[PDB]
Amino acid sequence: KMAFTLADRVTEEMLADKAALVVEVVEENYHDAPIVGIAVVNEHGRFFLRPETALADPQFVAWLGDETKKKSMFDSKRAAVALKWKGIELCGVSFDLLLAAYLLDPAQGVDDVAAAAKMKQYEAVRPDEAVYGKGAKRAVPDEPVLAEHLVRKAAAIWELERPFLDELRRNEQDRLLVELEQPLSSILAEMEFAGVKVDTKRLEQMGKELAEQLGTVEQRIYELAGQEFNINSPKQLGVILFEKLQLPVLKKTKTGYSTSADVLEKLAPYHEIVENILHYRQLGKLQSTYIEGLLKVVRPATKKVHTIFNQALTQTGRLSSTEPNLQNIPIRLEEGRKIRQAFVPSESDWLIFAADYSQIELRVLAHIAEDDNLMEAFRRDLDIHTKTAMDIFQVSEDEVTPNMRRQAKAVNYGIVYGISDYGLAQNLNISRKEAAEFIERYFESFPGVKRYMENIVQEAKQKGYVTTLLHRRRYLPDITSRNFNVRSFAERMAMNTPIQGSAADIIKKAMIDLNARLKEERLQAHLLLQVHDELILEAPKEEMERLCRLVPEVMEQAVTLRVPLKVDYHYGSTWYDAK
DNA sequence: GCGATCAGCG
DNA sequence: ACGCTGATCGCA
Ligand SMILES: [Ca+2]
């Protein structure tokens, strides 16, 4: 029903200097995945290509790799990484409909061309789910059906770039697309394809010792409980604690007794079993997610894991990381932190280099709220978390344990993002009256923060949305809801999203500038991971001293705020030692 | 599939 | 009754 050429060879009119390009990878994880078909729409017509012909044709390969031949795409990172696994470089992507859609409205959850097209009343393309099926029924259709679907996606991309660019421009988001998100897409593609090497011998040895300690703690739990049970069974666990042992019920879930770690910590005066259960769960978490789960995704020939950074998922502009998640590798407990010893450089005589912003959201908040005292604090490079711990526990700076600092950290963010006196009383094990008075005293010292929280909620109600420093936008329709609980959740999004999102804009800008400086200095160093406010790189040993000067400077100069940005950095033989 | 839970990020 | 995530597991 749409005219296109089912091409047998590549011809010169398919290689125009501007085109819409579809390089179709059906598998959710695109690493090393098949490319099932290619479509090209340009001023000369519409074309479908079989991958085994086009990707072995040297004029098409060169066209893909020519930066001056501009391509409009949907999810260019997926295509660029799948092509890298084919030994082919994709350059010249000048418009990415996924990232355009995500900037205009992150809550659409746009995951295919049909969903983005609908935003502009374009419906001459089908949802990917309707063409391929779902679950065990998923299949590549017959070539005529495939070709027409890939041509329709390309034709849609071709039509939609202009209306998306126009709305982006009206939102002040077009430089955000073209100068930030789209260049970041190519950097993430390199990071994902390079991967992270893993010491599988060390992991597997940790797994065996973990399995030994797991059984022991099981038996101490069975003994303390009198009997056996499925320590992960909420009904059987709930029955042991709250019926057999008759511990108080501090919290219920929609399903029944809560056994979350906060409950169990409060029950520790009552019985020794709850601490063994916490230790059991923690050991089980390391074994399931970080030992077995990671060995499951290691590519065996290279011992590399290749995460996927979702760049158009979070409602704040943060990345997320999937399969494996390399943004939530343990660090706080020493047992879990040793897993970071299995993450190693990919070449001998290379090192891991990590750098991260300290207290970035509080600095962003100081700049945006223009709170005099909070700006002064950061102009002094004070450690707000340690200072707040000193205040809470009535101790001195040397007496601040790491755990009391983690506590103060959650108080600092909690208060600015709307924790109630109840919530803070629960977290510090203090009375509710002392929690309310503490909070009022915190805003006495930072009245500009309080003004800003009130102003940003009223601005959300008037505009319908909130924005970040680089004009990322999040719509908040529940901000005028009549239900109190719905409206309250939306108000705390208005308080938090401009700050967390601005901090995500800054690290993205820093990654782009870092890559350019690394190329300007001709270093072999390259990014491996982003963890929200940290960058992880690997480089030859011989470049570490350069990176110690270059990387903190690039990150600190990514933007100019009314307070300085501060960056800490470490390097070493494994990710564990890069702290 | 979904909720509870927990790992990370602020 | 601070916010943003992803993976695992049991399933009142
Ligand atoms: Ca940090």
Residue numbers in the entry: 298 to 876
Q: What does the primary publication say about this deposited structure?
A:
We crystallized active substrate-bound BF polymerase F710Y/D598A with a 3′-amino terminal DNA primer and DNA template in the presence of Ca2+ and 2′-deoxyguanosine 5′-triphosphate (dGTP). Reactions were then initiated in the intact crystals by pH-shift from an acidic mother liquor (pH < 6) to a basic soaking liquor at pH 8.8, and reacting crystals were quenched at various times by flash freezing. By scaling reflections from 19 total crystals (resolution 2.0 – 2.7 Å) across the time course (0 – 24 h), we could estimate voxel-wise first-order rate constants for changes in real-space electron density across the asymmetric unit and particularly at the reaction center. Conformational changes in both the upstream and downstream nucleotides flanking the nascent bond are linearly correlated with covalent bonding. Unlike for native phosphodiester catalysis, only a single metal ion cofactor is detectable by crystallography during NP catalysis. The lack of electron density for an A-site metal ion in the ground state and at later time points is also consistent with the expectation of a neutral nucleophile in the NP reaction and the generally weak affinity of aliphatic amines for Ca2+.
Polymerases generate nascent strands of genetic material by stepwise phosphoryl transfer of nucleotides to primer termini, yielding O3′→P5′ phosphodiester linkages. We reported that 3′-NH2 primer extension can be catalyzed by a modified DNA polymerase, yielding N3′→P5′ phosphoramidate DNA (NP-DNA). The large fragment of DNA polymerase I (BF), cloned from the thermophilic soil bacterium Geobacillus stearothermophilus (Bst), acquires nontrivial levels of N3′→P5′ polymerase activity via two surprisingly minor substitutions: (A) a single active site mutation (F710Y) and (B) substitution of its divalent Mg2+ cofactors with Ca2+ (1). To add evidence that a single divalent metal ion cofactor catalyzes unnatural NP synthesis in BF, a polymerase A family member, we carried out a single nucleotide primer extension reaction in intact crystals.
